[PDB]
Amino acid sequence: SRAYDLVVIGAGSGGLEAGWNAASLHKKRVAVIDLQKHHGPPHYAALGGTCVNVGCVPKKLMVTGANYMDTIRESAGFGWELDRESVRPNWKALIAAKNKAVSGINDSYEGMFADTEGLTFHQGFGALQDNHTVLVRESADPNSAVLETLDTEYILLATGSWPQHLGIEGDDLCITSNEAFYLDEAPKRALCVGGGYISIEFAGIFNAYKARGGQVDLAYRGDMILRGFDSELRKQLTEQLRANGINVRTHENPAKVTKNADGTRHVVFESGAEADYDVVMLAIGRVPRSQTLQLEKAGVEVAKNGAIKVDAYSKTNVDNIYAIGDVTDRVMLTPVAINEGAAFVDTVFANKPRATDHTKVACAVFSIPPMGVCGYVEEDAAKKYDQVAVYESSFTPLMHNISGSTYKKFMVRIVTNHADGEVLGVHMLGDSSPEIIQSVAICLKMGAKISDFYNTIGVHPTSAEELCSMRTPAYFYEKGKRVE
Amino acid sequence: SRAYDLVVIGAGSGGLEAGWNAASLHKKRVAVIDLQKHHGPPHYAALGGTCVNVGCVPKKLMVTGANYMDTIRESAGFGWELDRESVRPNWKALIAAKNKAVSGINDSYEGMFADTEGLTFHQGFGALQDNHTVLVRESADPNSAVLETLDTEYILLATGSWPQHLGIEGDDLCITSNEAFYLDEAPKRALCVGGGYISIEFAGIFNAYKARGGQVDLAYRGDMILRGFDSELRKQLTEQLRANGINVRTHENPAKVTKNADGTRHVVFESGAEADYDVVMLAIGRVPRSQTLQLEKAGVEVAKNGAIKVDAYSKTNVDNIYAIGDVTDRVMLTPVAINEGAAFVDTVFANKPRATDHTKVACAVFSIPPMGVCGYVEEDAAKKYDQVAVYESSFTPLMHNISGSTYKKFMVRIVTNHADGEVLGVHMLGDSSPEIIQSVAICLKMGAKISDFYNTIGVHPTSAEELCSMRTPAYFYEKGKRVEKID
Ligand SMILES: Cc1cc2nc3c(=O)[nH]c(=O)nc-3n(C[C@H](O)[C@H](O)[C@H](O)COP(=O)(O)OP(=O)(O)OC[C@H]3O[C@@H](n4cnc5c(N)ncnc54)[C@H](O)[C@@H]3O)c2cc1C
Ligand SMILES: Cc1cc2nc3c(=O)[nH]c(=O)nc-3n(C[C@H](O)[C@H](O)[C@H](O)COP(=O)(O)OP(=O)(O)OC[C@H]3O[C@@H](n4cnc5c(N)ncnc54)[C@H](O)[C@@H]3O)c2cc1C
C-alpha cells in the first residue's frame, strides 16, 4: 500500500528530526537516505548532517581549542607562571580529538536506527523518478546504477547546502570549510575569503594554531565584514580581530590563484596586490544543494539559486512533497532546520498544521571574541516603525584591565519600538554573549519591553547585568531619519 | 530647612546610590558618611561599600585568577603543549593586581563628589543623637571626639553587615573574608569554616593558589553545603568540589583553635578530629551592623539580630528614618541594596512610592564551577501548590570529553506550577550559569511559562539551549508529596 509512508533525502539536522518523530511518534514506515555513515572525505557530511560532521559541533571544539591561546597569555596578569616561550599548539592533536568526538556521535546515530521500528537507513544518492518514486543511485551521475527504488506516500527533501565557489582561475587550488576540518597541518600563512561567520570563525582558529611568524589574512569584497549584523558590532569586531593579529582586508578578492613551486599558493587580488599562502579557504557563502535531485521529474518548482520554494508549512508546489532546512534558503541554522522538521511531522502525520516561526531567531558567531545576536538591526526596524530608540553600552570588563586585553570591550545594543518600548532586537559582542542571548530570545518571543529589562534586579558582577541597566536611548530614528 | 535634607550613614552600594540620586536628581543637600575613603585595614570597607572594597569586585577577580588552574590544565586535550611542571601560581601578584584595581575604583568615587553640587562626603563613625541629628565621631567609641554634627530632615541607615564570629577559644587566631583579601601568601593548608557562598568561593580560590602538596578543607556544621539552594545542585556541587581536590567536611565545626610553634593553627573539632592549617577562615554568616549607631536615641526599633526593622518602603518606626541594604537583613546582595536605594529616593523625594520586589531575585555563586539560580526551590513550591512539576537535565558538555575534566556536568532544573505551567524557579550548575541566569530572571519577572521556554528556537551549540529542550517532567509533587506521576 505504497512501500513507505515517508522517504527523507538527507539524514541531517532536519531530516533525522522529521524521520525519527514519524517513525517513533506515529509509527510510520520511514526510509532515510544519505551518502555515508561516518564523517570525512569524499562526502564530508554524513549520517547526522553538516552540523554534526562538518559544522557546528567540530567548529565549536576547534574554536574552544583556539581560545586557549588567549587564556594562556592572559593568565599572566593573574599571577600564573609557566615557561611561556616553550608553548606549542599541536593541530594534529586537536583534529585527532575532534575526529574521535565526531565519530562517536556518528556511531550513536546508527544505534538509534537499530532501536527504531520502521526507521531504516539507505546509503546512496537519492533522486526523484516522480512524486512517489525515490531512486537510490551509486553516484550523483544521473545514469549510474540504481541501487534501490523506493515507493512512498510522502517525500521530504532535506539535502542541505554546500560551499559556494567563485569563478576564478585557480578556484581548484582553494579549499572550503569541508577540507579545513581535515588539514594535515595548521597553515603558517592562510587566507579566508568571505565576510561571513564561517570565514571569521576560521581566521580565529587558524590564527591560534599557526606557527610563530605566521599570519592570517581575511579578505572580503565588501566594505565591512558580517553583512547583516548590527553595523556597530561589525566595526568593533573588526577592531578586536585586528588587535589579535588577523589582517582584515575589506574591498579585496582573489582574481587569479596560482600554485607556487613549493606547494603554497599565490594570490593576485582585484587590487593588483599579490600574496602567497599555504592554504586559501573559500567561505563566500553556501548554496542550496538541490542540483542533482531531478526535481524536474516531479515538477517541483525551484528558484534561481536552487532553493526549493516552500510555503510556511514547508510544502512544495506538489502537495505530497515537502522541503525543510538549508535547501529552502530561509534561515540556515540547525535549530531552525530541526523545528521545521518537527513542524512537518505535526502537519502531515498528526493533522495539527504547524508553521515554524523564522522571526526572533537568535544566533551566535563564535569568533574570538564571540557575538550573540537576536531580532532587528536598527536599519530594518527603522523602515518598519514610527520611531525606534537605539540603546547602546560598552565597557572593558575589569578582569581585562588586569589580563592585558584592554581591547576586549563588551558591547550591548538594544533596539526598540519607541512608541510602546517593545524590544525589537538585542545585539551583543563579548565573551559569554552566545550563552546570554538564548534566554534573551525567550524575552523577545514573549513580547518583552525595555521596562521589563531595566526593572529586573541585576546579577553582580556579570556582563549580562548590563542588559538591565539601560534606561536612556543613545539616539533614535524618526521616519527612517536619524534623530537626536 | 535643616542643615541637610538627607544624611546617609554608609557610603556603600545602597547609600551611594541613594545619595547620588537625591543629590544629582532632586538637587537636595545630602551628606554621606563612611569610615575611610580607600579600601584596606583597619576598617576594610570604605567609600563604595563592601562589594567594591572587600566583596563582589575583588572576589570575582580572584576567582577568575583561580580558574586558570583548570583552564591551563584542560588546555592539553586541545593540543596545547607546554612544560607542565613549570606552571606556578604567584599569589602576591594576584593581590597586587586586585589592589590596583580596587584603589582605582576608590579614586573614581572621590571624583564623583567633586562634581556633584549637594553631594558631600564626611568621614568617621556616624551615630545618632536624635531623629534629626547625626554625629560623625572620630571612632566607634561613644567617648570620641564628635568631629561634626549634621542637622537633617531624613536619615538613611545603610551600614551593611559584618562577618560573624564563633565564640570559641582561639577565635582571634582565625580570620574572616576581610583579612583573606590581604593575606601576604597563599595558605598551603586552609580551613574554610561555613556552608554559605563566601566559604565555598574562598575554598576554591585557596584550592587554586596553594603550594603543591597543599590542601583546602571546607568545614560545615550542617548536613549539606549551601542551605537554601536546590538540593540536587547542592549535592552535585559537593562532588565537583571534591573532584577538584577540596575536602568537604560535613557535620564538622571547630571547637578550639590554639597556635602552633611554626605559627600555623592547630584546630580541634567538635568531633575530636584535629588538624593543622596556615589559615582558618570564618565565613559562618554576616550580621547586620547596627550596634554602634545609637538607635536607642532616635527610637528606632531593631530585631534581635541587630537587623533594623523596616516596612516594604524601607521606612523604620520613626517616619523620617529609613534603612536599606544588608542592615535590613532582607536579601543581602548588591543589586537589591542599590534597588532599595533608588526606591527610597522615589518614595521620599519624588513622592513616587516604590517598594523593592525581593522575590525572584537572580543570584550567582562563583564556585568552581559556578551556579546561577532564580525563584523557588521545589520544596517551597510544593508547600504552596497542589501540583508542581520538576524538569531536569544534566549532560557533560563535549568539550569536557576532550579537556579531560569529565566530572564537570552542566545541570539545569526548572520547577513549575503544573496547573498552568508557570516557571517558579530555574536553577543551573555549570560554566556560564551566572550569565545565563540574568536573562532567565527577566523571563520569570514577566511570568514566563515552560511552554514559552521550549517554544523558543535554540542557539547551538551552547549550554543555554538546554533550557529550550525540556518538555517532559521528571517527577511531581502532589499536595506536598513526591510522586512519579499525577494520578
Ligand atoms: C562550517 C559550518 C559551521 C556551522 N555552524 C553552525 C552553528 O554553530 N550553529 C548552527 O545552528 N548552524 C551552523 N551551521 C549550519 C548548519 O549546519 C545547517 O544550517 C544545518 O545543518 C542544516 O540542516 P539540514 O537538515 O538542512 O541539512 P544538513 O544537516 O546539511 O544535512 C543534509 C544531508 O543530506 C545529504 N545529502 C545531500 N544530497 C543528498 C542526496 N542526493 N542523497 C542523499 N543524501 C544527500 C548530505 O550528505 C547531508 O548529510 C554551520 C554550517 C557550516 C558549513
Ligand atoms: C566576600 C563577599 C563577597 C560578596 N560577593 C557578592 C557578589 O558576588 N554579588 C553580590 O551581589 N553581593 C556580594 N556580597 C554582598 C554585598 O557586598 C552586600 O550585599 C552589599 O555590599 C551590601 O550593601 P550595603 O549598602 O547594604 O552596605 P555596604 O556595601 O556594606 O556598605 C556599608 C558601608 O557603611 C560603612 N559603615 C558602617 N558603619 C558605619 C558607621 N557607623 N559610620 C560610618 N560608616 C559606616 C561601612 O564601612 C561600609 O562601607 C558579598 C559580600 C561579601 C562580604
GROMACS .gro file of N, CA and C in nm, chain A residues 51 56-57 60-61 64-65 68-69 71-72 74-75 78-83 86-90 94 97 208-209 334-335 357 361-362 364 366 398-399 402 432 434-436 438-443 446 448 452 455-465 467-468, chain B residues 51 56-57 60-61 64-65 68-69 71-72 74-75 78-83 86-90 93 97 208-209 334-335 357 362 364 366 398-399 402 432 434-436 438-443 445-446 448 452-453 456-465 468:
model
  381
   51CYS      N    1   2.595   1.974   1.042
   51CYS     CA    2   2.627   2.023   1.174
   51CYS      C    3   2.714   1.929   1.258
   56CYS      N    4   2.866   2.285   1.308
   56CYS     CA    5   2.859   2.333   1.444
   56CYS      C    6   2.941   2.261   1.545
   57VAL      N    7   2.929   2.129   1.550
   57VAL     CA    8   2.995   2.054   1.652
   57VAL      C    9   3.147   2.054   1.647
   60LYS      N   10   3.293   2.416   1.703
   60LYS     CA   11   3.292   2.460   1.844
   60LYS      C   12   3.407   2.402   1.922
   61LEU      N   13   3.442   2.276   1.900
   61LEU     CA   14   3.554   2.216   1.970
   61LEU      C   15   3.685   2.288   1.925
   64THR      N   16   3.708   2.639   2.060
   64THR     CA   17   3.741   2.621   2.202
   64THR      C   18   3.891   2.600   2.216
   65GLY      N   19   3.948   2.520   2.124
   65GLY     CA   20   4.091   2.496   2.124
   65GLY      C   21   4.164   2.625   2.097
   68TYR      N   22   4.236   2.883   2.395
   68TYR     CA   23   4.343   2.868   2.491
   68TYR      C   24   4.466   2.952   2.459
   69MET      N   25   4.480   3.001   2.335
   69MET     CA   26   4.592   3.087   2.303
   69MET      C   27   4.580   3.205   2.398
   71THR      N   28   4.384   3.255   2.669
   71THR     CA   29   4.383   3.235   2.811
   71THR      C   30   4.520   3.204   2.866
   72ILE      N   31   4.609   3.150   2.783
   72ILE     CA   32   4.742   3.116   2.833
   72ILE      C   33   4.816   3.248   2.850
   74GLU      N   34   4.670   3.567   2.882
   74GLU     CA   35   4.602   3.641   2.987
   74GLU      C   36   4.621   3.593   3.132
   75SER      N   37   4.656   3.467   3.154
   75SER     CA   38   4.673   3.417   3.291
   75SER      C   39   4.790   3.478   3.363
   78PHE      N   40   4.717   3.736   3.627
   78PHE     CA   41   4.663   3.685   3.750
   78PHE      C   42   4.761   3.607   3.831
   79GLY      N   43   4.889   3.629   3.803
   79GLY     CA   44   4.992   3.561   3.879
   79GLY      C   45   5.024   3.417   3.844
   80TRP      N   46   4.989   3.372   3.722
   80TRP     CA   47   5.020   3.234   3.679
   80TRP      C   48   5.153   3.236   3.603
   81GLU      N   49   5.247   3.155   3.651
   81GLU     CA   50   5.381   3.148   3.595
   81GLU      C   51   5.410   3.014   3.531
   82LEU      N   52   5.455   3.018   3.405
   82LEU     CA   53   5.492   2.896   3.330
   82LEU      C   54   5.592   2.939   3.221
   83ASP      N   55   5.662   2.843   3.162
   83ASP     CA   56   5.759   2.876   3.056
   83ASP      C   57   5.675   2.916   2.937
   86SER      N   58   5.806   2.812   2.577
   86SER     CA   59   5.810   2.672   2.541
   86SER      C   60   5.676   2.630   2.478
   87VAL      N   61   5.574   2.713   2.497
   87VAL     CA   62   5.441   2.679   2.447
   87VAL      C   63   5.424   2.656   2.297
   88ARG      N   64   5.369   2.540   2.266
   88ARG     CA   65   5.341   2.500   2.129
   88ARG      C   66   5.201   2.435   2.117
   89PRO      N   67   5.117   2.487   2.024
   89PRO     CA   68   4.991   2.424   1.980
   89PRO      C   69   5.017   2.308   1.886
   90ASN      N   70   4.941   2.201   1.904
   90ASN     CA   71   4.951   2.082   1.823
   90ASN      C   72   4.818   2.062   1.750
   94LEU      N   73   4.453   1.832   1.804
   94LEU     CA   74   4.323   1.892   1.807
   94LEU      C   75   4.231   1.807   1.715
   97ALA      N   76   4.146   1.462   1.833
   97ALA     CA   77   4.043   1.468   1.937
   97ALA      C   78   3.906   1.489   1.870
  208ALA      N   79   4.522   3.100   1.587
  208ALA     CA   80   4.576   3.046   1.711
  208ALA      C   81   4.667   2.928   1.692
  209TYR      N   82   4.641   2.850   1.587
  209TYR     CA   83   4.724   2.730   1.567
  209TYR      C   84   4.844   2.743   1.471
  334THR      N   85   2.089   2.507   1.226
  334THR     CA   86   2.042   2.377   1.272
  334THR      C   87   1.910   2.379   1.352
  335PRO      N   88   1.901   2.467   1.453
  335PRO     CA   89   1.781   2.463   1.537
  335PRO      C   90   1.661   2.498   1.451
  357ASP      N   91   0.825   2.953   1.303
  357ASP     CA   92   0.835   3.096   1.309
  357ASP      C   93   0.983   3.133   1.290
  361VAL      N   94   1.470   3.468   1.572
  361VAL     CA   95   1.558   3.353   1.582
  361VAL      C   96   1.695   3.405   1.621
  362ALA      N   97   1.746   3.364   1.736
  362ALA     CA   98   1.877   3.412   1.780
  362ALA      C   99   1.988   3.328   1.726
  364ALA      N  100   2.455   3.293   1.712
  364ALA     CA  101   2.585   3.331   1.762
  364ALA      C  102   2.693   3.316   1.655
  366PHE      N  103   3.082   3.242   1.675
  366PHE     CA  104   3.188   3.202   1.764
  366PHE      C  105   3.324   3.256   1.725
  398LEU      N  106   3.647   4.427   3.398
  398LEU     CA  107   3.756   4.453   3.491
  398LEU      C  108   3.870   4.356   3.478
  399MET      N  109   3.836   4.229   3.463
  399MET     CA  110   3.939   4.127   3.450
  399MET      C  111   4.038   4.157   3.338
  402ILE      N  112   4.323   4.380   3.397
  402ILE     CA  113   4.432   4.308   3.463
  402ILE      C  114   4.497   4.204   3.372
  432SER      N  115   3.074   3.514   2.645
  432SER     CA  116   2.951   3.471   2.703
  432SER      C  117   2.827   3.518   2.630
  434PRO      N  118   2.689   3.432   2.343
  434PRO     CA  119   2.606   3.321   2.292
  434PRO      C  120   2.521   3.248   2.397
  435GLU      N  121   2.575   3.236   2.517
  435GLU     CA  122   2.502   3.174   2.628
  435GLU      C  123   2.393   3.271   2.679
  436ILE      N  124   2.430   3.399   2.683
  436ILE     CA  125   2.342   3.504   2.729
  436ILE      C  126   2.227   3.528   2.633
  438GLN      N  127   2.051   3.339   2.439
  438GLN     CA  128   1.947   3.235   2.439
  438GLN      C  129   1.825   3.275   2.520
  439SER      N  130   1.848   3.311   2.647
  439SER     CA  131   1.738   3.350   2.737
  439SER      C  132   1.682   3.485   2.695
  440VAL      N  133   1.766   3.569   2.635
  440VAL     CA  134   1.717   3.695   2.586
  440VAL      C  135   1.616   3.662   2.478
  441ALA      N  136   1.639   3.554   2.403
  441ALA     CA  137   1.548   3.511   2.295
  441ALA      C  138   1.407   3.475   2.347
  442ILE      N  139   1.402   3.421   2.468
  442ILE     CA  140   1.276   3.388   2.529
  442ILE      C  141   1.201   3.520   2.553
  443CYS      N  142   1.271   3.620   2.605
  443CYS     CA  143   1.214   3.753   2.631
  443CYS      C  144   1.152   3.808   2.505
  446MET      N  145   0.838   3.652   2.396
  446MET     CA  146   0.729   3.685   2.486
  446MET      C  147   0.674   3.826   2.473
  448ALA      N  148   0.860   4.108   2.534
  448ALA     CA  149   0.927   4.194   2.632
  448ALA      C  150   0.951   4.337   2.588
  452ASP      N  151   1.091   4.588   3.099
  452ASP     CA  152   1.095   4.455   3.156
  452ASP      C  153   1.239   4.421   3.187
  455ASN      N  154   1.380   4.669   3.486
  455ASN     CA  155   1.308   4.651   3.611
  455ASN      C  156   1.343   4.521   3.679
  456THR      N  157   1.426   4.440   3.613
  456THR     CA  158   1.470   4.311   3.669
  456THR      C  159   1.596   4.345   3.746
  457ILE      N  160   1.607   4.293   3.866
  457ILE     CA  161   1.723   4.314   3.952
  457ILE      C  162   1.845   4.239   3.897
  458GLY      N  163   1.955   4.312   3.880
  458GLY     CA  164   2.074   4.253   3.824
  458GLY      C  165   2.144   4.146   3.904
  459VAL      N  166   2.227   4.068   3.835
  459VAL     CA  167   2.312   3.964   3.897
  459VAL      C  168   2.452   4.024   3.889
  460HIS      N  169   2.523   4.029   4.001
  460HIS     CA  170   2.650   4.101   4.004
  460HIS      C  171   2.766   4.027   4.068
  461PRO      N  172   2.888   4.036   4.011
  461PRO     CA  173   2.916   4.108   3.886
  461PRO      C  174   2.908   4.013   3.766
  462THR      N  175   2.840   4.052   3.658
  462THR     CA  176   2.836   3.969   3.538
  462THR      C  177   2.832   4.067   3.425
  463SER      N  178   2.849   4.020   3.304
  463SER     CA  179   2.838   4.111   3.192
  463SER      C  180   2.693   4.127   3.160
  464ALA      N  181   2.620   4.016   3.167
  464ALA     CA  182   2.476   4.012   3.139
  464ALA      C  183   2.392   4.119   3.212
  465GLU      N  184   2.435   4.158   3.331
  465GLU     CA  185   2.361   4.257   3.405
  465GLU      C  186   2.354   4.391   3.334
  467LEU      N  187   2.244   4.432   3.050
  467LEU     CA  188   2.113   4.422   2.983
  467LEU      C  189   2.004   4.492   3.063
  468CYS      N  190   2.023   4.501   3.194
  468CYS     CA  191   1.925   4.558   3.286
  468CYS      C  192   1.955   4.697   3.335
  535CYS      N  193   3.103   4.554   4.869
  535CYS     CA  194   3.110   4.490   4.739
  535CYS      C  195   3.236   4.537   4.671
  540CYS      N  196   3.213   4.165   4.626
  540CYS     CA  197   3.196   4.124   4.486
  540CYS      C  198   3.314   4.143   4.390
  541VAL      N  199   3.355   4.268   4.368
  541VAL     CA  200   3.463   4.302   4.277
  541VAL      C  201   3.592   4.225   4.297
  544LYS      N  202   3.557   3.834   4.257
  544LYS     CA  203   3.539   3.786   4.121
  544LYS      C  204   3.674   3.783   4.047
  545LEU      N  205   3.756   3.886   4.070
  545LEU     CA  206   3.886   3.897   4.008
  545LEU      C  207   3.970   3.784   4.055
  548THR      N  208   3.843   3.447   3.901
  548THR     CA  209   3.891   3.443   3.762
  548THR      C  210   4.036   3.389   3.761
  549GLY      N  211   4.117   3.448   3.847
  549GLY     CA  212   4.253   3.403   3.863
  549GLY      C  213   4.252   3.257   3.903
  552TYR      N  214   4.214   2.982   3.616
  552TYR     CA  215   4.327   2.949   3.529
  552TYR      C  216   4.392   2.819   3.562
  553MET      N  217   4.380   2.774   3.685
  553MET     CA  218   4.434   2.646   3.717
  553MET      C  219   4.364   2.535   3.637
  555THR      N  220   4.177   2.586   3.356
  555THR     CA  221   4.198   2.624   3.216
  555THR      C  222   4.333   2.574   3.159
  556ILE      N  223   4.443   2.605   3.230
  556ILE     CA  224   4.578   2.564   3.191
  556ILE      C  225   4.587   2.413   3.182
  558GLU      N  226   4.332   2.199   3.132
  558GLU     CA  227   4.239   2.149   3.032
  558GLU      C  228   4.282   2.180   2.892
  559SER      N  229   4.381   2.267   2.882
  559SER     CA  230   4.427   2.306   2.753
  559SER      C  231   4.498   2.194   2.681
  562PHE      N  232   4.324   1.987   2.403
  562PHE     CA  233   4.302   2.054   2.279
  562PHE      C  234   4.425   2.088   2.201
  563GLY      N  235   4.533   2.021   2.238
  563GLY     CA  236   4.662   2.036   2.173
  563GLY      C  237   4.756   2.145   2.221
  564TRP      N  238   4.752   2.186   2.348
  564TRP     CA  239   4.845   2.291   2.390
  564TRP      C  240   4.953   2.226   2.466
  565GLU      N  241   5.074   2.238   2.413
  565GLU     CA  242   5.190   2.177   2.476
  565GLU      C  243   5.276   2.281   2.546
  566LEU      N  244   5.310   2.255   2.671
  566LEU     CA  245   5.393   2.347   2.748
  566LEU      C  246   5.452   2.262   2.858
  567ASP      N  247   5.555   2.315   2.927
  567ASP     CA  248   5.622   2.241   3.035
  567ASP      C  249   5.527   2.247   3.152
  570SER      N  250   5.634   2.344   3.499
  570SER     CA  251   5.675   2.482   3.517
  570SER      C  252   5.558   2.578   3.558
  571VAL      N  253   5.434   2.528   3.563
  571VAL     CA  254   5.321   2.615   3.597
  571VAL      C  255   5.327   2.645   3.748
  572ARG      N  256   5.318   2.773   3.786
  572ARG     CA  257   5.327   2.817   3.927
  572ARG      C  258   5.235   2.934   3.956
  573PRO      N  259   5.156   2.921   4.062
  573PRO     CA  260   5.071   3.033   4.098
  573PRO      C  261   5.149   3.132   4.179
  574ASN      N  262   5.135   3.260   4.149
  574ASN     CA  263   5.203   3.364   4.223
  574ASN      C  264   5.095   3.447   4.294
  577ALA      N  265   5.126   3.838   4.325
  577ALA     CA  266   5.098   3.914   4.203
  577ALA      C  267   4.947   3.937   4.194
  581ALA      N  268   4.759   4.310   4.184
  581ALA     CA  269   4.667   4.346   4.074
  581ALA      C  270   4.527   4.378   4.128
  692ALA      N  271   4.321   2.676   4.441
  692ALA     CA  272   4.398   2.704   4.322
  692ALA      C  273   4.538   2.764   4.342
  693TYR      N  274   4.556   2.853   4.440
  693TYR     CA  275   4.688   2.916   4.457
  693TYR      C  276   4.776   2.853   4.562
  818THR      N  277   2.425   4.307   4.642
  818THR     CA  278   2.438   4.444   4.597
  818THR      C  279   2.323   4.500   4.514
  819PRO      N  280   2.278   4.427   4.411
  819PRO     CA  281   2.175   4.492   4.327
  819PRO      C  282   2.047   4.523   4.404
  841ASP      N  283   1.096   4.475   4.499
  841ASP     CA  284   1.045   4.340   4.492
  841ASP      C  285   1.162   4.252   4.532
  846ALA      N  286   1.755   3.707   4.086
  846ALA     CA  287   1.853   3.603   4.045
  846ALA      C  288   1.984   3.617   4.126
  848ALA      N  289   2.413   3.451   4.190
  848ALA     CA  290   2.513   3.356   4.143
  848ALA      C  291   2.608   3.322   4.254
  850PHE      N  292   3.000   3.204   4.266
  850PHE     CA  293   3.123   3.188   4.188
  850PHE      C  294   3.216   3.081   4.237
  882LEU      N  295   3.052   1.836   2.567
  882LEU     CA  296   3.150   1.766   2.481
  882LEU      C  297   3.296   1.811   2.501
  883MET      N  298   3.317   1.942   2.502
  883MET     CA  299   3.446   1.999   2.528
  883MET      C  300   3.504   1.929   2.651
  886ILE      N  301   3.693   1.606   2.583
  886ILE     CA  302   3.825   1.628   2.533
  886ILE      C  303   3.915   1.687   2.642
  916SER      N  304   2.928   2.944   3.285
  916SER     CA  305   2.838   3.040   3.225
  916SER      C  306   2.700   3.056   3.293
  918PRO      N  307   2.603   3.199   3.575
  918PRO     CA  308   2.580   3.337   3.620
  918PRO      C  309   2.533   3.433   3.513
  919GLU      N  310   2.585   3.415   3.392
  919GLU     CA  311   2.550   3.500   3.281
  919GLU      C  312   2.410   3.466   3.225
  920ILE      N  313   2.384   3.336   3.209
  920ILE     CA  314   2.258   3.284   3.157
  920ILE      C  315   2.139   3.322   3.251
  922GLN      N  316   2.081   3.573   3.433
  922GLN     CA  317   2.032   3.710   3.427
  922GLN      C  318   1.912   3.721   3.333
  923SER      N  319   1.920   3.668   3.210
  923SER     CA  320   1.804   3.681   3.121
  923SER      C  321   1.689   3.594   3.164
  924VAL      N  322   1.718   3.483   3.226
  924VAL     CA  323   1.611   3.398   3.273
  924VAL      C  324   1.535   3.477   3.375
  925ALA      N  325   1.607   3.553   3.457
  925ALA     CA  326   1.542   3.632   3.562
  925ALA      C  327   1.442   3.725   3.494
  926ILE      N  328   1.478   3.783   3.380
  926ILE     CA  329   1.385   3.870   3.311
  926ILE      C  330   1.256   3.795   3.271
  927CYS      N  331   1.269   3.670   3.229
  927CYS     CA  332   1.151   3.593   3.190
  927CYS      C  333   1.064   3.572   3.309
  929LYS      N  334   1.035   3.736   3.580
  929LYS     CA  335   0.977   3.864   3.615
  929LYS      C  336   0.846   3.873   3.536
  930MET      N  337   0.857   3.858   3.405
  930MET     CA  338   0.744   3.864   3.313
  930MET      C  339   0.641   3.755   3.323
  932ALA      N  340   0.690   3.415   3.253
  932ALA     CA  341   0.711   3.302   3.161
  932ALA      C  342   0.655   3.164   3.206
  936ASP      N  343   0.669   2.874   2.703
  936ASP     CA  344   0.742   2.987   2.647
  936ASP      C  345   0.889   2.953   2.625
  937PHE      N  346   0.943   2.873   2.715
  937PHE     CA  347   1.080   2.829   2.707
  937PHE      C  348   1.100   2.735   2.589
  940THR      N  349   1.082   2.840   2.226
  940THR     CA  350   1.184   2.929   2.171
  940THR      C  351   1.287   2.847   2.090
  941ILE      N  352   1.326   2.899   1.977
  941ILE     CA  353   1.425   2.830   1.899
  941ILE      C  354   1.567   2.839   1.965
  942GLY      N  355   1.633   2.725   1.983
  942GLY     CA  356   1.764   2.727   2.047
  942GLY      C  357   1.881   2.785   1.969
  943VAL      N  358   1.990   2.816   2.042
  943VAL     CA  359   2.114   2.870   1.984
  943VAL      C  360   2.207   2.751   2.005
  944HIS      N  361   2.274   2.709   1.898
  944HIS     CA  362   2.353   2.585   1.902
  944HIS      C  363   2.490   2.607   1.841
  945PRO      N  364   2.594   2.544   1.898
  945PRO     CA  365   2.581   2.484   2.029
  945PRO      C  366   2.617   2.573   2.149
  946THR      N  367   2.536   2.563   2.256
  946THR     CA  368   2.556   2.635   2.382
  946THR      C  369   2.505   2.550   2.501
  947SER      N  370   2.545   2.579   2.623
  947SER     CA  371   2.486   2.505   2.734
  947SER      C  372   2.339   2.556   2.752
  948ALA      N  373   2.319   2.685   2.731
  948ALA     CA  374   2.188   2.752   2.745
  948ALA      C  375   2.070   2.694   2.666
  949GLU      N  376   2.091   2.648   2.544
  949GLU     CA  377   1.981   2.597   2.461
  949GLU      C  378   1.911   2.478   2.527
  952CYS      N  379   1.559   2.527   2.645
  952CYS     CA  380   1.457   2.524   2.545
  952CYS      C  381   1.431   2.382   2.497
   0.00000   0.00000   0.00000
